[PDB]
């Protein structure tokens, strides 16, 4: 049951976290009306969110003699730095990076 | 004894946190040098030269063991590990064996 787009398949994954601004009615009429209130004060909210994940690693103990292939940046000069902001403040990711650079036997 | 080995072949590397231990074993051959003699040598014995190349010294019947190069201890992959993951390194301990 490994997910086909990649990753870890779990029967009990991290739960969904749901959030909502509590409605605040505007001034109701001074005579009773049984219909649900339709007039509300315009509101929004802001805040900080933190997520901390501990990951377990599995180290390599290869006996390969020659050097491996490694992900690296290229020294050649360019207008911008890869994985940084440009002059207008926009961050970008210039390429997809996988995980398979070290090698193992079958 | 004649029929018993005096040591084993030890050659690997252990990466232990902030330490790395390298071990190397090689096979060597030693001839007789100089017909067991000490000889005086100089640029006179070498055939002469300019003043900048003159020298005087001695050759001995002894040989010596040298391992003062990094590839005597690090495989290319181990060197890659070291240089891709560390700001620094330095040697701390040495053990030397001669056997068989």
From TrEMBL, chain B:
Subcellular location: Virion
Family membership: Belongs to the parvoviridae capsid protein family.
Protein name (record): Capsid protein VP1
Gene source species: Adeno-associated virus 9
Span of the entire protein shown here: 220 to 319 of 736
């Amino acid at each position: 049951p490994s997910p086909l787009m990649g990753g870890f398949g779990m029967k009990h994954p991290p739960p969904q976290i749901l959030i909502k601004n509590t409605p605040v009615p505007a001034d109701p009429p001074t005579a009773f009306n049984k219909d649900k209130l339709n007039s509300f004060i315009t509101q929004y909210s802001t805040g900080q969110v933190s997520v901390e994940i501990e990951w377990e690693l599995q180290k390599e103990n290869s006996k390969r003699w020659n050097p491996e292939i490694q992900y690296t940046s290229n020294y050649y000069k360019s207008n911008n730095v890869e994985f940084a902001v440009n002059t207008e403040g926009v961050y970008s990711e210039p390429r997809p990076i996988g995980t398979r650079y070290l090698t193992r036997n079958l | 004894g004649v029929g018993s080995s005096s040591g084993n072949w030890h050659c690997d590397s252990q990466w232990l946190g902030d330490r790395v231990i390298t071990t190397s074993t090689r096979t060597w051959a030693l001839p007789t040098y100089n017909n067991h003699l000490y000889k005086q040598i100089s640029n006179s014995t070498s055939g002469g030269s300019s003043n900048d190349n003159a020298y005087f010294g001695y050759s001995t019947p002894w040989g010596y063991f040298d391992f003062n190069r990094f590839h005597c201890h690090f495989s290319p992959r181990d060197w890659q590990r070291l240089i891709n993951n560390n700001w620094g390194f330095r040697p701390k301990r040495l053990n030397f064996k001669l056997f068989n």
